[PDB]
Design a binder for this molecule. Structure first.
Ligand SMILES: *[C@@H]1O[C@H](CO)[C@@H](O)[C@H](O)[C@H]1NC(C)=O
Ligand SMILES: *[C@@H]1O[C@H](CO)[C@@H](O)[C@H](O)[C@H]1NC(C)=O
Ligand SMILES: *[C@H]1O[C@H](CO)[C@@H](O)[C@H](O)[C@@H]1O
Ligand SMILES: *[C@H]1O[C@H](CO)[C@@H](O)[C@H](O)[C@@H]1O
Ligand SMILES: *[C@H]1O[C@H](CO)[C@@H](O)[C@H](O)[C@@H]1O
Ligand SMILES: *[C@H]1O[C@H](CO)[C@@H](O)[C@H](O)[C@@H]1O
Ligand SMILES: *[C@H]1O[C@H](CO)[C@@H](O)[C@H](O)[C@@H]1O
Ligand SMILES: *[C@H]1O[C@H](CO)[C@@H](O)[C@H](O)[C@@H]1O
Ligand SMILES: [Ca+2]
Ligand SMILES: [Ca+2]
Ligand SMILES: [Ca+2]
Ligand SMILES: [Ca+2]
Ligand SMILES: [Ca+2]
Ligand SMILES: [Ca+2]
Ligand SMILES: [Ca+2]
Ligand SMILES: [Ca+2]
Ligand SMILES: [Ca+2]
Ligand SMILES: [Ca+2]
Ligand SMILES: [Ca+2]
Ligand SMILES: [Ca+2]
Ligand SMILES: [Ca+2]
Ligand SMILES: [Ca+2]
Ligand SMILES: [Ca+2]
Ligand SMILES: [Ca+2]
Ligand SMILES: [Ca+2]
Ligand SMILES: [Ca+2]
Lengths: 417, 417
């Protein structure tokens, strides 16, 4: 056993060692004895010049093609001489040379990371492989200086495995749709060789945003007895998420009043609220409708808006007349100033639509006077004469100030005693 | 017009006012003239005693049953006397009394709020209604002193509407499944009346938790050529979410080596990895398998574990013999120590499974000697005699140290010159 040592990938004709002398042989002895050198399994990697007895590198010695991922590598040369036939053994180690760079399976990698992913959670990032063995194979990793993600180098200790790509900062798809990272790797053996990777990460859309109405409060005015289907309002809502997490369906809140839910209808898609049932100002002066906009995600989110509608009074109620008192038949002796009947007037409407004025036929001695708001007394004006006219027919007309106006009458047969 | 003023719900016989004197009438004048008092639309709410000329409360005067939600309330009494017939008008206002408490539509309310709901977002909380009007109707709200939610009282200003139930602290379904709030409301008018509500809020399950393996690293040892289907490992993963967000499907990572993906199979449900293809120690010493556990939510989350398996070498390779040199035919003159053939031995296995010893038939003059590791030279021992035996048959047996062991032979016909 005689041991030599050379680095791989050596230049053609590299001095391995004077094999003749080291085997105790002499120069004039080499040629006649047919000094031969053979390899075990490889081939013509090493050759011997007989004139100087020098063992040298014959062909390209690629270490990784021989031992591969093995730590120890050595070419075994058997040496044969004849007359007499002697056999010697020389083993020459092949030291590793850092002539291969750290390579990744993919130069660019599309990663898909969810927006809902918790912090302090790492994603399996592929590591680079190296053909070399030893310090030349010791890999050092480096992440691009970005704020969203951090890197954690693997350790030898058990219960901890995998190249670390750790979350420490929150992520939002709407703010930044894609993040581009760069992973650089350098071996430990000099000269240094590098490897780069362009990680293209597209953050997935999570349903973490609720729909939002342009106006948080809508105020519309609606007349009375407007036909069903009349466009009350048109609402618009928006949502930052995409897909079914972005599409919005409209509805009335579950806390809505039954009468309100029966008086109005809302298009789930259009968001336009229209009149459904009869609307009376004298029944309800206004309505306060809560509107819910809800997306179509797995876990639905809801936004809300308040739509208050003030009903507007129209003159649609005919005035009411009522004789509350009577003093009939009236004596002929009755002086000027006596009261015959007390009149009461009402109007269900409001404002000028409910402001009623009263009049009467002028062919009657009696007079009409306002004693109080919406109250009249039919007072005898001028004198009478029983035999001339023993009877009268007092028609009283009540008329509101609406535009247009409604009117009602009330007659009374006034007999004279 | 003569005006009086009384609080509602007055005791029977409550002094409203001396109506006779205030109308300028006299006591002895009331009875003969049939002093009468009537209401406009209500009825026998007020009555007059003629002996003292006193107007008083006759029956129960419930304000809210009269004017309702109206601000102004007043009973209109028309007064009639006869001989001569005169008509007077007295209006008596009915002031509001805080005799009705703030009432909610529901004493207890099941609210359903998502775990994914953003902060600073309020949920529509129903308000209480009150029959009274004025300061007695001014409502003050109060939320139970809880940490998760806060309350925001409604304002008169537009663009701001709805009873505020504001999120300011994060919410987690797994930590606290339900939160119970208490809403208390007090009117502004004295005496104070209250209203309580038990809000039962059940936070909905969001898919915000990734599955987690009990062990982040599994290390198993597997022999060689073990039949396909052999249980390599059994992995367990857990997840805090419920439903389809909790169920976990197992698989091999997308970055797995093709050979590894073809050599092993993993049950998506059971999580048990078994042998699929042939496994050779001489081809691959070990495997590093990344295992992904992914839930079945709308936005899937994935946990990962590393399962490394070290293959164990078995003695399944028969030793190799090789005659690398020959000096036949051997001269009879050849002395003791001459070399006939050089022998080389190999074994693809490792350890004692690859430790080969050599022997030979003892009925042969020649000798076997170790020159180097796995190398033998067939050296002539003792002397010869051409005419006696002109030929030989040297059988050499190589045998590894495995348990059990494998062996191979190599014979050579040694002719003597
Ligand atoms: C609603 O969405 C946005 C406003 O947020 C606007 O661009 C769009 O035109 C609106 N659609 C309608 C129908 O008004
Ligand atoms: C896996 O889930 C838990 C451990 O996290 C355990 O209670 C359960 O029994 C395990 N199941 C199996 C089949 O090992
Ligand atoms: C009021 O008076 C008119 C005329 O007399 C009637 O036609 C009407 O029906 C109401 O009685
Ligand atoms: C008004 O109408 C009534 C009938 O409703 C008559 O009786 C009265 O004389 C006046 O014409
Ligand atoms: C008023 O009207 C009535 C209607 O019949 C008469 O009967 C009465 O005499 C007076 O003319
Ligand atoms: C080694 O030698 C044995 C005995 O001669 C043979 O049977 C075998 O095939 C191998 O050649
Ligand atoms: C071993 O076997 C060979 C044939 O393979 C013979 O030629 C030899 O003589 C020895 O018997
Ligand atoms: C070794 O074996 C061979 C087998 O044929 C013979 O031919 C030779 O003479 C010697 O005996
Ligand atoms: Ca190389
Ligand atoms: Ca190398
Ligand atoms: Ca290298
Ligand atoms: Ca989103
Ligand atoms: Ca978002
Ligand atoms: Ca959404
Ligand atoms: Ca009306
Ligand atoms: Ca009217
Ligand atoms: Ca009206
Ligand atoms: Ca009351
Ligand atoms: Ca009251
Ligand atoms: Ca009250
Ligand atoms: Ca959850
Ligand atoms: Ca959770
Ligand atoms: Ca989950
Ligand atoms: Ca094997
Ligand atoms: Ca073996
Ligand atoms: Ca083996």
């Amino acid at each position: 056993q005689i041991h030599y040592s050379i680095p791989e990938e050596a230049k053609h004709g590299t001095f391995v060692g004077r094999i003749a002398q080291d085997l105790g042989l002499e120069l004039t002895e080499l040629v006649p004895r047919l000094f031969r050198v053979a390899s075990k399994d490889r081939g013509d990697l090493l050759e011997v010049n007989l004139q100087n007895g020098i063992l040298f590198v014959n062909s390209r010695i690629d270490r990784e093609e021989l031992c591969g991922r093995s730590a120890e590598c050595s070419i075994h040369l058997e040496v044969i001489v004849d007359r007499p036939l002697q056999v010697f053994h020389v083993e020459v180690e092949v030291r590793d040379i850092n002539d291969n760079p750290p390579r990744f399976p993919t130069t660019q990698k599309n990663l898909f990371i969810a927006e809902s992913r918790p912090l302090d959670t790492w994603f399996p990032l592929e590591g680079a492989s190296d053909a070399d063995i030893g310090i030349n194979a010791v890999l050092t990793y480096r992440l691009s200086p970005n704020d969203y993600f951090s890197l954690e180098k693997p350790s030898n200790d058990e219960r901890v495995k995998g190249l670390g790509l750790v979350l420490r900062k929150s992520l939002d798809r709407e703010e930044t749709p894609e993040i581009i990272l760069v992973l650089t790797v350098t071996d430990g053996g000099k000269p240094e060789l590098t490897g780069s990777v362009q990680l293209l990460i597209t953050v997935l859309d999570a349903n973490d945003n609720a729909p939002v109405f342009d106006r948080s409060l809508y105020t519309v005015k609606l007349p009375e007895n407007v036909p069903n289907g009349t466009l009350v309002v048109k609402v618009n809502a928006s949502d930052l998420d995409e897909g079914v997490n972005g599409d919005i369906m409209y509805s009335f809140s579950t806390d809505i009043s039954p009468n309100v839910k029966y008086k109005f209808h809302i298009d789930p898609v259009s968001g336009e609220i229209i009149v459904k049932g009869y609307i009376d100002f004298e029944e309800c002066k206004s309505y306060e409708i809560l509107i819910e906009g809800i997306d179509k995600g797995q876990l639905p989110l809801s936004g809300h808006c308040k739509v208050i509608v003030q009903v507007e009074d129209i003159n649609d109620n005919v005035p009411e007349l009522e004789f509350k008192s009577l003093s009939l038949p009236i004596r002929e002796n009755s002086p000027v100033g006596t009261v015959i009947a007390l009149i009461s007037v009402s109007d269900r409407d409001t404002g000028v639509n409910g402001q009623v004025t009263c009049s009467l036929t002028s062919h009657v001695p009696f007079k009409l006077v306002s004693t109080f708001k919406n109250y009249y007394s039919l007072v005898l004006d001028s004198a009478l004469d029983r035999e001339t006219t023993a009877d009268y027919k007092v028609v009283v007309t009540a008329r509101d100030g609406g535009s247009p106006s409604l009117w009602a009458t009330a007659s009374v047969s006034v007999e004279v005693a």
